[PDB]
Amino acid sequence: DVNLYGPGGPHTALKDIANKYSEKTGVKVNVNFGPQATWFEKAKKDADILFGASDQSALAIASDFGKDFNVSKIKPLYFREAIILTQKGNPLKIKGLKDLANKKVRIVVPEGAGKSNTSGTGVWEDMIGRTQDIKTIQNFRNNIVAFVPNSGSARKLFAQDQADAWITWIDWSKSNPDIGTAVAIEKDLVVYRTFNVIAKEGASKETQDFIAYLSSKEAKEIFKKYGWREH
Template sequence: MRYLMFLLCCLSLGVAYADINLYGPGGPHTALKEAAAKFTEKTGIRVNVNFGPQATWFEKAKNDADILFGASDQSALAIATDFGGSFNVNKIKPLYLREAIILTQKGNPLKIKSLKDLANKQVRIVVPEGSGKSNTSGTGVWEDMIGRTQDIKTIQKFRNNIVAFVPNSGSAKKLFVEDKADAWITWSDWAKSNPNLGTAVAIEKDLVIYRTLNVVAKENSPKEVYDFINFLSTKESKSIFAKYGWRE
């Protein structure tokens, strides 16, 4: 009702609001686009969710980005920093989190049951890894998890099974679809957003890690930008994000 009254007031005053432009990596975009559509339905304010590797949207975003979103705090910090002082890294706001998973080929033909299996079996693993060049949420994830075994031989065996270090999840997905990898270290939202891509396998509770979806508004943004950010934490938005594996 509050949003409807806001919209009617704007129409009666002849106020036209510019689009809200979001930029960030692939993955969170599925839930964000659905939430954006619902916000537009309620307010009449159009929200554009631009996603993909940073290099594909960075120049455009420098001109019209209202909100940056990230798929982990470390990557969001790196992305926002690239914009200089336009986005205050101290105002990055975590909204939801999700867990890392193993995505296997359909039906899990190698019967992978755990992260340790990826070290102890003959498995081709693909991992997103920024390597100091790409701001991806996958940076360091495999090491953070398998390192918790506190066993250097297990870590060595796991690393020996990695057949590709790729700059982002899109690159990992491409190799996985081409059957050049048996297992992809990824996030639960990728499996939820692509249910026919493969079979998700949970990682051991003592090894699995979680990372966040977060947002940050451009400094001195108009009120409607913050209205959208606040909308992302409403009950309605929470139900949308839950469908894609995100939780508080």
């Protein structure tokens, strides 16, 4: 088998891609996903590829594997925009990040806090910081009700109606259309983060072949469906 490990998020596109690849080639490709702690020990034994939902988080995770992976070999392949996910129907009429700072709303953001490797780390401050207004930054931060360890944790909190807004990625909405209503972030504030892959040292030909497939016309189309861009 070709075994991939990485965070929830890119996993939906990857599962579709792996399925199509397996149908075509006969090579069994397994997409393991979730918080790092849930698969780390098994991945140490059989990981062929580590995929990431951002560069900083991918660097962190790959580093944890020691000499089994050479972190210089992380390959960015696609990117997607951050979004604001509101409760279905957007009851508070949220219109962007500045609006979030101005209104009395509960925001949930994933932040690693140096003890979790999550695509979210640094995102909210980099976006709202581009307003170049300390009051706005303060107000926004004052509305954050929870800094959670990963996107999965934010999803759970959000689904339990404990937050009005979740700072996340377009793909989370594309993968879960019914869970909330996506609101686009100001183009002058938004950040775009990448999907990446890294093959283990001594990766098999089959593993390398699948990596190549991630750049095929067929894979690009699947990625596009989930909001991942090049372009």
